[PDB]
Amino acid sequence: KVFGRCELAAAMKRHGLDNYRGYSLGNWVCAAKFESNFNTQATNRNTDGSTDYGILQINSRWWCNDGRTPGSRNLCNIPCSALLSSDITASVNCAKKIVSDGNGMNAWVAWRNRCKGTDVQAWIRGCRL
Numbered sequence: 317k318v319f320g321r322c323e324l325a326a327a328m329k330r331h332g333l334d335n336y337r338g339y340s341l342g343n344w345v346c347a348a349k350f351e352s353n354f355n356t357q358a359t360n361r362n363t364d365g366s367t368d369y370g371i372l373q374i375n376s377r378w379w380c381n382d383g384r385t386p387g388s389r390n391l392c393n394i395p396c397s398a399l400l401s402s403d404i405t406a407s408v409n410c411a412k413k414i415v416s417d418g419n420g421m422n423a424w425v426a427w428r429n430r431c432k433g434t435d436v437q438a439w440i441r442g443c444r445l
């Protein structure tokens with residue numbers, strides 16, 4: 317599913333992402349924009365052989381099992397395919413684990429390069445929330 321901007325903000329809020337670990341909703345929406353362009357089915361293969369999955373491009377080296385990432389872990393205890401659902405529950409639950417890990421949202425490189433320090437509130441402006 318390709319979410320609308322406000323539609324995803326509402327879904328993220330419903331699922332408890334607003335100010336999770338102190339990161340406002342705009343931060344999460346901005347990270348989703350640049351990671352996946354709001355497309356739950358986004359995938360992208362990395363040079364190391366891992367793959368990024370879903371709206372928040374969660375990676376198979378640590379967080380999910382795809383069966384093809386040697387040496388990897390599955391710390392969210394989910395198949396990576398769960399991260400491609402129209403229902404963002406699995407992505408959210410795993411993202412909360414990730415953002416709790418130490419480096420906050422710096423775990424998402426697109427967030428650190430394109431969202432961090434910006435006026436992220438723009439991403440939820442106008443939305444019925």
